[PDB]
Amino acid sequence: HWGYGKHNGPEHWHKDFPIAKGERQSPVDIDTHTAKYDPSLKPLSVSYDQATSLRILNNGHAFNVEFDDSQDKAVLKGGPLDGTYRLIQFHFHWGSLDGQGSEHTVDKKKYAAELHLVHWNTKYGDFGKAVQQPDGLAVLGIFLKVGSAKPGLQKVVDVLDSIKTKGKSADFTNFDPRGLLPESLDYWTYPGSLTTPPLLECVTWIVLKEPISVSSEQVLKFRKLNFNGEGEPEELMVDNWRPAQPLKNRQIKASF
Ligand SMILES: [Hg+2]
Ligand SMILES: [Hg+2]
Ligand SMILES: [Zn+2]
């Protein structure tokens, strides 16, 4: 099935998911000189004090940290959004080398990794219903550069051993996502899509301007994961990123 190799890679996705060549595909290169300052855009409202993480699972293309979204416990509001979006899960995209790994680029610059905090619009009732709407999801994108260690990420780094291969999961309670936010909440926003099949065009992207730094050894542990299931030939989970797509008819707005 789809993956990130030379034979089932992003360049092949269109065959099984024609939307791959759609009008609002993600990710994109953020041209900073062309982005438009929009003064009508409100500050982002991140309310994660009551977040309930549940588990971590290796789904064969990334590792997701899943949260309880049966109530308005960890929500996103404000910015270019309308209403309340509940956090369902967070995951990352990383490279084989520190010079690549992010999906979005800034003036063509690529970061070592990119974090995506996935949220769904509560007037649609469930995640499944949300993906069929134009304003169904909100994804908060955070870049990672290699430098100093990020204290708040080590709990995630330490459990990776436990979910090495596809289909493994581990209890992952009391993880606070607040430890992954940069100091500033300045962002860029545009209408896009999921970056993995089914590539549904139901996402409002919010990409923070300020990256968080992680140590070389923290990113190293990400690179130890496997795309393959247990007892299969080992294939390192590396370069699970989709390259930039054409902006086409869209405008990228800046909150600053
Ligand atoms: Hg997958
Ligand atoms: Hg949609
Ligand atoms: Zn993602």
PDB file of C-alpha atoms and ligand atoms in Angstrom:
ATOM      1  CA  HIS A   1       0.000   0.000   0.000  1.00  0.00           C
ATOM      2  CA  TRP A   2       1.024   3.652   0.179  1.00  0.00           C
ATOM      3  CA  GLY A   3       4.209   4.514   2.053  1.00  0.00           C
ATOM      4  CA  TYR A   4       7.370   6.585   1.559  1.00  0.00           C
ATOM      5  CA  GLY A   5       9.629   4.329  -0.547  1.00  0.00           C
ATOM      6  CA  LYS A   6      10.589   4.665  -4.205  1.00  0.00           C
ATOM      7  CA  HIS A   7       7.808   2.321  -5.207  1.00  0.00           C
ATOM      8  CA  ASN A   8       4.884   3.620  -2.999  1.00  0.00           C
ATOM      9  CA  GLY A   9       6.082   7.125  -2.233  1.00  0.00           C
ATOM     10  CA  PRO A  10       4.371  10.504  -2.556  1.00  0.00           C
ATOM     11  CA  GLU A  11       4.966  10.525  -6.306  1.00  0.00           C
ATOM     12  CA  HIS A  12       2.704   7.504  -6.624  1.00  0.00           C
ATOM     13  CA  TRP A  13      -0.160   8.456  -4.303  1.00  0.00           C
ATOM     14  CA  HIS A  14      -2.255  10.064  -6.987  1.00  0.00           C
ATOM     15  CA  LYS A  15      -3.089   6.665  -8.534  1.00  0.00           C
ATOM     16  CA  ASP A  16      -5.041   5.555  -5.491  1.00  0.00           C
ATOM     17  CA  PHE A  17      -5.929   9.095  -4.270  1.00  0.00           C
ATOM     18  CA  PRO A  18      -6.502  11.462  -7.210  1.00  0.00           C
ATOM     19  CA  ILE A  19      -7.116  14.328  -4.818  1.00  0.00           C
ATOM     20  CA  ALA A  20      -3.332  14.217  -4.534  1.00  0.00           C
ATOM     21  CA  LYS A  21      -3.341  16.639  -7.472  1.00  0.00           C
ATOM     22  CA  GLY A  22      -6.072  18.844  -5.991  1.00  0.00           C
ATOM     23  CA  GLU A  23      -6.222  22.623  -5.573  1.00  0.00           C
ATOM     24  CA  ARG A  24      -5.591  22.801  -1.818  1.00  0.00           C
ATOM     25  CA  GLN A  25      -2.920  20.158  -1.152  1.00  0.00           C
ATOM     26  CA  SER A  26      -0.435  20.355   1.672  1.00  0.00           C
ATOM     27  CA  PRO A  27       2.343  20.979   2.613  1.00  0.00           C
ATOM     28  CA  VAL A  28       3.584  24.143   0.878  1.00  0.00           C
ATOM     29  CA  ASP A  29       6.633  26.411   0.950  1.00  0.00           C
ATOM     30  CA  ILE A  30       5.920  29.517   2.957  1.00  0.00           C
ATOM     31  CA  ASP A  31       7.358  32.458   0.987  1.00  0.00           C
ATOM     32  CA  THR A  32       7.796  35.040   3.770  1.00  0.00           C
ATOM     33  CA  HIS A  33       7.965  38.083   1.502  1.00  0.00           C
ATOM     34  CA  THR A  34       4.678  37.108  -0.128  1.00  0.00           C
ATOM     35  CA  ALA A  35       2.668  36.150   2.985  1.00  0.00           C
ATOM     36  CA  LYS A  36       0.101  38.824   3.834  1.00  0.00           C
ATOM     37  CA  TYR A  37      -0.025  40.420   7.297  1.00  0.00           C
ATOM     38  CA  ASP A  38      -3.716  40.199   8.276  1.00  0.00           C
ATOM     39  CA  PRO A  39      -4.598  42.469  11.222  1.00  0.00           C
ATOM     40  CA  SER A  40      -8.128  40.992  11.551  1.00  0.00           C
ATOM     41  CA  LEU A  41      -6.642  37.640  12.623  1.00  0.00           C
ATOM     42  CA  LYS A  42      -6.968  37.033  16.366  1.00  0.00           C
ATOM     43  CA  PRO A  43      -4.395  35.498  18.665  1.00  0.00           C
ATOM     44  CA  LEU A  44      -4.456  31.683  18.878  1.00  0.00           C
ATOM     45  CA  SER A  45      -6.172  30.303  21.982  1.00  0.00           C
ATOM     46  CA  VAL A  46      -4.471  27.052  23.138  1.00  0.00           C
ATOM     47  CA  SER A  47      -6.226  25.539  26.213  1.00  0.00           C
ATOM     48  CA  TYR A  48      -4.404  22.310  27.011  1.00  0.00           C
ATOM     49  CA  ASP A  49      -4.373  22.398  30.809  1.00  0.00           C
ATOM     50  CA  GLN A  50      -6.954  19.587  30.972  1.00  0.00           C
ATOM     51  CA  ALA A  51      -5.489  17.335  28.267  1.00  0.00           C
ATOM     52  CA  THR A  52      -5.797  13.612  28.811  1.00  0.00           C
ATOM     53  CA  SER A  53      -3.253  11.586  26.837  1.00  0.00           C
ATOM     54  CA  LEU A  54      -4.170   7.878  26.578  1.00  0.00           C
ATOM     55  CA  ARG A  55      -1.707   6.027  24.406  1.00  0.00           C
ATOM     56  CA  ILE A  56       1.062   5.995  21.885  1.00  0.00           C
ATOM     57  CA  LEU A  57       0.938   3.803  18.762  1.00  0.00           C
ATOM     58  CA  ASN A  58       3.160   3.071  15.753  1.00  0.00           C
ATOM     59  CA  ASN A  59       0.725   3.061  12.809  1.00  0.00           C
ATOM     60  CA  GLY A  60       3.305   2.123  10.204  1.00  0.00           C
ATOM     61  CA  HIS A  61       3.921   5.641   8.936  1.00  0.00           C
ATOM     62  CA  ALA A  62       4.458   7.580  12.235  1.00  0.00           C
ATOM     63  CA  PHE A  63       3.772   7.331  15.933  1.00  0.00           C
ATOM     64  CA  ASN A  64       0.631   9.056  17.257  1.00  0.00           C
ATOM     65  CA  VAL A  65       0.115  10.159  20.874  1.00  0.00           C
ATOM     66  CA  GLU A  66      -3.703   9.869  21.274  1.00  0.00           C
ATOM     67  CA  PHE A  67      -5.867  11.950  23.570  1.00  0.00           C
ATOM     68  CA  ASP A  68      -9.413  11.568  24.932  1.00  0.00           C
ATOM     69  CA  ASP A  69     -11.554  13.843  22.737  1.00  0.00           C
ATOM     70  CA  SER A  70     -14.968  12.827  24.177  1.00  0.00           C
ATOM     71  CA  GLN A  71     -15.167  16.175  25.918  1.00  0.00           C
ATOM     72  CA  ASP A  72     -13.806  19.704  25.435  1.00  0.00           C
ATOM     73  CA  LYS A  73     -10.611  19.016  27.430  1.00  0.00           C
ATOM     74  CA  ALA A  74      -7.807  20.219  25.141  1.00  0.00           C
ATOM     75  CA  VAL A  75      -8.990  22.758  22.609  1.00  0.00           C
ATOM     76  CA  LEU A  76      -7.898  25.233  20.015  1.00  0.00           C
ATOM     77  CA  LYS A  77      -9.833  28.404  19.243  1.00  0.00           C
ATOM     78  CA  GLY A  78      -9.173  31.911  17.897  1.00  0.00           C
ATOM     79  CA  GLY A  79      -6.587  32.582  15.146  1.00  0.00           C
ATOM     80  CA  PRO A  80      -8.415  32.143  11.826  1.00  0.00           C
ATOM     81  CA  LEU A  81     -10.733  29.554  13.360  1.00  0.00           C
ATOM     82  CA  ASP A  82     -14.434  29.672  14.038  1.00  0.00           C
ATOM     83  CA  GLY A  83     -15.552  27.644  17.062  1.00  0.00           C
ATOM     84  CA  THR A  84     -13.855  24.957  19.064  1.00  0.00           C
ATOM     85  CA  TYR A  85     -11.487  22.272  17.765  1.00  0.00           C
ATOM     86  CA  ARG A  86     -10.616  19.352  20.081  1.00  0.00           C
ATOM     87  CA  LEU A  87      -7.148  17.737  20.074  1.00  0.00           C
ATOM     88  CA  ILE A  88      -7.309  14.081  18.985  1.00  0.00           C
ATOM     89  CA  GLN A  89      -3.627  13.238  18.454  1.00  0.00           C
ATOM     90  CA  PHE A  90      -0.129  14.560  17.721  1.00  0.00           C
ATOM     91  CA  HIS A  91       2.583  13.021  15.547  1.00  0.00           C
ATOM     92  CA  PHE A  92       5.805  14.034  13.821  1.00  0.00           C
ATOM     93  CA  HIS A  93       7.508  13.841  10.398  1.00  0.00           C
ATOM     94  CA  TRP A  94      11.327  13.547  10.390  1.00  0.00           C
ATOM     95  CA  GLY A  95      14.248  12.849   8.072  1.00  0.00           C
ATOM     96  CA  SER A  96      17.182  10.514   7.718  1.00  0.00           C
ATOM     97  CA  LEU A  97      19.569  13.486   8.201  1.00  0.00           C
ATOM     98  CA  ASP A  98      19.139  16.760  10.162  1.00  0.00           C
ATOM     99  CA  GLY A  99      19.009  18.795   6.904  1.00  0.00           C
ATOM    100  CA  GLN A 100      15.506  17.507   6.010  1.00  0.00           C
ATOM    101  CA  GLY A 101      12.374  16.113   7.680  1.00  0.00           C
ATOM    102  CA  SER A 102       9.810  18.937   7.880  1.00  0.00           C
ATOM    103  CA  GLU A 103       6.883  18.999   5.429  1.00  0.00           C
ATOM    104  CA  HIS A 104       6.336  22.765   5.328  1.00  0.00           C
ATOM    105  CA  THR A 105       9.370  24.841   4.404  1.00  0.00           C
ATOM    106  CA  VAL A 106      10.072  28.524   5.093  1.00  0.00           C
ATOM    107  CA  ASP A 107      11.674  30.377   2.128  1.00  0.00           C
ATOM    108  CA  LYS A 108      12.614  26.853   1.035  1.00  0.00           C
ATOM    109  CA  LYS A 109      14.401  26.103   4.329  1.00  0.00           C
ATOM    110  CA  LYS A 110      13.754  22.535   5.605  1.00  0.00           C
ATOM    111  CA  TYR A 111      13.824  21.700   9.349  1.00  0.00           C
ATOM    112  CA  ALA A 112      14.866  18.378  10.961  1.00  0.00           C
ATOM    113  CA  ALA A 113      11.312  17.534  11.877  1.00  0.00           C
ATOM    114  CA  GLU A 114       7.789  18.849  12.011  1.00  0.00           C
ATOM    115  CA  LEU A 115       5.155  18.277  14.785  1.00  0.00           C
ATOM    116  CA  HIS A 116       1.462  18.194  13.967  1.00  0.00           C
ATOM    117  CA  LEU A 117      -1.192  18.635  16.650  1.00  0.00           C
ATOM    118  CA  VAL A 118      -4.451  17.431  15.038  1.00  0.00           C
ATOM    119  CA  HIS A 119      -7.775  18.979  16.027  1.00  0.00           C
ATOM    120  CA  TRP A 120     -11.400  18.507  14.823  1.00  0.00           C
ATOM    121  CA  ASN A 121     -14.323  20.960  14.703  1.00  0.00           C
ATOM    122  CA  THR A 122     -16.755  20.011  17.459  1.00  0.00           C
ATOM    123  CA  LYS A 123     -19.871  21.220  15.485  1.00  0.00           C
ATOM    124  CA  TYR A 124     -19.375  18.066  13.374  1.00  0.00           C
ATOM    125  CA  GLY A 125     -19.578  15.649  16.325  1.00  0.00           C
ATOM    126  CA  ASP A 126     -16.832  13.129  15.514  1.00  0.00           C
ATOM    127  CA  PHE A 127     -13.507  13.090  13.711  1.00  0.00           C
ATOM    128  CA  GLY A 128     -14.975  10.915  10.969  1.00  0.00           C
ATOM    129  CA  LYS A 129     -17.616  13.553  10.175  1.00  0.00           C
ATOM    130  CA  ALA A 130     -15.137  16.428  10.421  1.00  0.00           C
ATOM    131  CA  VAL A 131     -12.865  15.140   7.630  1.00  0.00           C
ATOM    132  CA  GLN A 132     -15.737  15.510   5.080  1.00  0.00           C
ATOM    133  CA  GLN A 133     -16.000  19.263   5.638  1.00  0.00           C
ATOM    134  CA  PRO A 134     -14.076  22.240   4.343  1.00  0.00           C
ATOM    135  CA  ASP A 135     -13.431  23.606   7.863  1.00  0.00           C
ATOM    136  CA  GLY A 136     -13.369  20.208   9.577  1.00  0.00           C
ATOM    137  CA  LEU A 137      -9.848  20.097  10.950  1.00  0.00           C
ATOM    138  CA  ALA A 138      -7.237  22.474  12.342  1.00  0.00           C
ATOM    139  CA  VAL A 139      -3.555  21.343  12.387  1.00  0.00           C
ATOM    140  CA  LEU A 140      -0.984  23.244  14.467  1.00  0.00           C
ATOM    141  CA  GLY A 141       2.456  22.789  12.832  1.00  0.00           C
ATOM    142  CA  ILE A 142       5.668  23.279  14.807  1.00  0.00           C
ATOM    143  CA  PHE A 143       9.172  22.992  13.332  1.00  0.00           C
ATOM    144  CA  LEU A 144      12.018  21.248  15.186  1.00  0.00           C
ATOM    145  CA  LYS A 145      15.665  22.341  14.677  1.00  0.00           C
ATOM    146  CA  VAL A 146      18.610  20.398  16.239  1.00  0.00           C
ATOM    147  CA  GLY A 147      20.233  22.216  19.154  1.00  0.00           C
ATOM    148  CA  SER A 148      19.513  21.982  22.858  1.00  0.00           C
ATOM    149  CA  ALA A 149      17.379  19.190  24.293  1.00  0.00           C
ATOM    150  CA  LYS A 150      13.641  19.811  24.783  1.00  0.00           C
ATOM    151  CA  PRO A 151      12.780  18.627  28.257  1.00  0.00           C
ATOM    152  CA  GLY A 152       9.116  18.109  27.494  1.00  0.00           C
ATOM    153  CA  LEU A 153       9.843  15.602  24.669  1.00  0.00           C
ATOM    154  CA  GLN A 154      11.933  13.059  26.617  1.00  0.00           C
ATOM    155  CA  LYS A 155       8.924  11.068  27.968  1.00  0.00           C
ATOM    156  CA  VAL A 156       7.950  10.494  24.300  1.00  0.00           C
ATOM    157  CA  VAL A 157      11.568   9.597  23.409  1.00  0.00           C
ATOM    158  CA  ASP A 158      11.797   7.001  26.228  1.00  0.00           C
ATOM    159  CA  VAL A 159       8.658   4.955  25.247  1.00  0.00           C
ATOM    160  CA  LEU A 160       9.633   4.614  21.538  1.00  0.00           C
ATOM    161  CA  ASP A 161      11.468   1.371  22.415  1.00  0.00           C
ATOM    162  CA  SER A 162       8.105  -0.202  23.261  1.00  0.00           C
ATOM    163  CA  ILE A 163       6.329   0.571  19.965  1.00  0.00           C
ATOM    164  CA  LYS A 164       9.228  -0.120  17.558  1.00  0.00           C
ATOM    165  CA  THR A 165       7.189  -1.906  14.854  1.00  0.00           C
ATOM    166  CA  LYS A 166       3.850  -1.266  13.124  1.00  0.00           C
ATOM    167  CA  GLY A 167       0.754  -2.060  15.134  1.00  0.00           C
ATOM    168  CA  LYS A 168       2.386  -1.838  18.615  1.00  0.00           C
ATOM    169  CA  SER A 169       0.833   0.505  21.218  1.00  0.00           C
ATOM    170  CA  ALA A 170       1.659   1.422  24.832  1.00  0.00           C
ATOM    171  CA  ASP A 171      -0.278   3.205  27.587  1.00  0.00           C
ATOM    172  CA  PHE A 172       0.847   6.829  27.545  1.00  0.00           C
ATOM    173  CA  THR A 173      -1.015   8.666  30.310  1.00  0.00           C
ATOM    174  CA  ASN A 174      -0.465  12.087  31.848  1.00  0.00           C
ATOM    175  CA  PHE A 175       1.646  13.572  29.027  1.00  0.00           C
ATOM    176  CA  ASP A 176       1.250  17.385  28.909  1.00  0.00           C
ATOM    177  CA  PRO A 177       1.473  18.817  25.315  1.00  0.00           C
ATOM    178  CA  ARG A 178       2.268  22.209  26.729  1.00  0.00           C
ATOM    179  CA  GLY A 179       5.911  21.162  27.021  1.00  0.00           C
ATOM    180  CA  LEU A 180       6.092  21.117  23.154  1.00  0.00           C
ATOM    181  CA  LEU A 181       5.018  24.756  22.491  1.00  0.00           C
ATOM    182  CA  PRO A 182       7.524  27.445  21.586  1.00  0.00           C
ATOM    183  CA  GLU A 183       7.443  30.734  23.508  1.00  0.00           C
ATOM    184  CA  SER A 184       5.689  32.705  20.770  1.00  0.00           C
ATOM    185  CA  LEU A 185       2.385  31.868  19.141  1.00  0.00           C
ATOM    186  CA  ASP A 186       2.975  34.024  15.965  1.00  0.00           C
ATOM    187  CA  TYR A 187       1.827  31.996  12.963  1.00  0.00           C
ATOM    188  CA  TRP A 188       1.105  31.632   9.307  1.00  0.00           C
ATOM    189  CA  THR A 189      -2.220  30.162   8.108  1.00  0.00           C
ATOM    190  CA  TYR A 190      -3.702  28.842   4.839  1.00  0.00           C
ATOM    191  CA  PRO A 191      -6.367  26.355   3.735  1.00  0.00           C
ATOM    192  CA  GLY A 192      -4.916  22.892   2.979  1.00  0.00           C
ATOM    193  CA  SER A 193      -5.209  19.174   3.405  1.00  0.00           C
ATOM    194  CA  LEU A 194      -3.995  16.109   5.305  1.00  0.00           C
ATOM    195  CA  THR A 195      -0.406  15.376   4.172  1.00  0.00           C
ATOM    196  CA  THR A 196      -0.931  11.607   4.116  1.00  0.00           C
ATOM    197  CA  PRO A 197      -3.593   9.625   2.255  1.00  0.00           C
ATOM    198  CA  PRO A 198      -6.480  10.145   2.137  1.00  0.00           C
ATOM    199  CA  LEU A 199      -5.213  13.718   1.579  1.00  0.00           C
ATOM    200  CA  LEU A 200      -8.646  15.150   2.283  1.00  0.00           C
ATOM    201  CA  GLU A 201      -8.790  18.935   1.784  1.00  0.00           C
ATOM    202  CA  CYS A 202     -10.443  19.719   5.088  1.00  0.00           C
ATOM    203  CA  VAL A 203      -7.666  21.447   6.982  1.00  0.00           C
ATOM    204  CA  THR A 204      -6.976  24.910   8.273  1.00  0.00           C
ATOM    205  CA  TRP A 205      -3.186  24.959   8.739  1.00  0.00           C
ATOM    206  CA  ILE A 206      -1.600  27.027  11.515  1.00  0.00           C
ATOM    207  CA  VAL A 207       2.179  26.945  11.210  1.00  0.00           C
ATOM    208  CA  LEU A 208       4.097  28.591  14.089  1.00  0.00           C
ATOM    209  CA  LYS A 209       6.902  30.952  13.160  1.00  0.00           C
ATOM    210  CA  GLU A 210       9.173  29.860  16.021  1.00  0.00           C
ATOM    211  CA  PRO A 211      10.742  26.407  16.000  1.00  0.00           C
ATOM    212  CA  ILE A 212      11.426  24.395  19.168  1.00  0.00           C
ATOM    213  CA  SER A 213      14.921  22.911  19.421  1.00  0.00           C
ATOM    214  CA  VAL A 214      15.640  19.239  20.203  1.00  0.00           C
ATOM    215  CA  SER A 215      19.003  17.468  20.680  1.00  0.00           C
ATOM    216  CA  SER A 216      20.699  15.301  18.129  1.00  0.00           C
ATOM    217  CA  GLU A 217      20.171  12.269  20.442  1.00  0.00           C
ATOM    218  CA  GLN A 218      16.394  12.916  20.758  1.00  0.00           C
ATOM    219  CA  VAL A 219      15.949  12.945  16.915  1.00  0.00           C
ATOM    220  CA  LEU A 220      18.196   9.847  16.765  1.00  0.00           C
ATOM    221  CA  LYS A 221      15.657   7.760  18.684  1.00  0.00           C
ATOM    222  CA  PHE A 222      12.911   8.732  16.198  1.00  0.00           C
ATOM    223  CA  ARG A 223      15.091   7.205  13.471  1.00  0.00           C
ATOM    224  CA  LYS A 224      15.196   3.880  15.282  1.00  0.00           C
ATOM    225  CA  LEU A 225      11.489   3.157  14.600  1.00  0.00           C
ATOM    226  CA  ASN A 226      10.288   0.721  11.944  1.00  0.00           C
ATOM    227  CA  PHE A 227       7.733   1.057   9.155  1.00  0.00           C
ATOM    228  CA  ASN A 228       7.482  -2.781   9.082  1.00  0.00           C
ATOM    229  CA  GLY A 229       5.570  -4.985  11.505  1.00  0.00           C
ATOM    230  CA  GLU A 230       7.210  -7.314  13.980  1.00  0.00           C
ATOM    231  CA  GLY A 231       9.072 -10.228  12.377  1.00  0.00           C
ATOM    232  CA  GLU A 232       9.399  -8.538   9.025  1.00  0.00           C
ATOM    233  CA  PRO A 233      12.467  -7.275   7.260  1.00  0.00           C
ATOM    234  CA  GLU A 234      13.562  -4.099   9.019  1.00  0.00           C
ATOM    235  CA  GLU A 235      12.939  -0.810   7.349  1.00  0.00           C
ATOM    236  CA  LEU A 236      13.865   2.284   9.336  1.00  0.00           C
ATOM    237  CA  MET A 237      11.042   4.847   9.764  1.00  0.00           C
ATOM    238  CA  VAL A 238      12.828   7.775   8.227  1.00  0.00           C
ATOM    239  CA  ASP A 239      11.860  10.468   5.697  1.00  0.00           C
ATOM    240  CA  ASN A 240       8.115  10.127   6.360  1.00  0.00           C
ATOM    241  CA  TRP A 241       7.485  13.585   4.842  1.00  0.00           C
ATOM    242  CA  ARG A 242       5.610  14.754   1.758  1.00  0.00           C
ATOM    243  CA  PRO A 243       7.328  17.416  -0.364  1.00  0.00           C
ATOM    244  CA  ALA A 244       5.874  20.881  -0.913  1.00  0.00           C
ATOM    245  CA  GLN A 245       2.812  21.096  -3.233  1.00  0.00           C
ATOM    246  CA  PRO A 246       1.837  24.001  -5.543  1.00  0.00           C
ATOM    247  CA  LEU A 247       0.133  26.885  -3.773  1.00  0.00           C
ATOM    248  CA  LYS A 248      -2.121  27.478  -6.736  1.00  0.00           C
ATOM    249  CA  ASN A 249      -5.015  29.777  -5.961  1.00  0.00           C
ATOM    250  CA  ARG A 250      -4.150  30.362  -2.298  1.00  0.00           C
ATOM    251  CA  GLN A 251      -3.026  33.103  -0.044  1.00  0.00           C
ATOM    252  CA  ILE A 252      -0.894  32.486   3.004  1.00  0.00           C
ATOM    253  CA  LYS A 253      -1.704  35.037   5.743  1.00  0.00           C
ATOM    254  CA  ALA A 254       0.573  36.023   8.648  1.00  0.00           C
ATOM    255  CA  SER A 255      -0.540  36.991  12.148  1.00  0.00           C
ATOM    256  CA  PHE A 256       2.534  39.237  12.503  1.00  0.00           C
TER     257      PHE A 256
HETATM  258 HG    HG B   1       0.012   3.735   7.642  1.00  0.00          HG
HETATM  259 HG    HG B   2     -13.145  18.552   3.037  1.00  0.00          HG
HETATM  260 ZN    ZN B   3       1.406  15.198   9.937  1.00  0.00          ZN
END
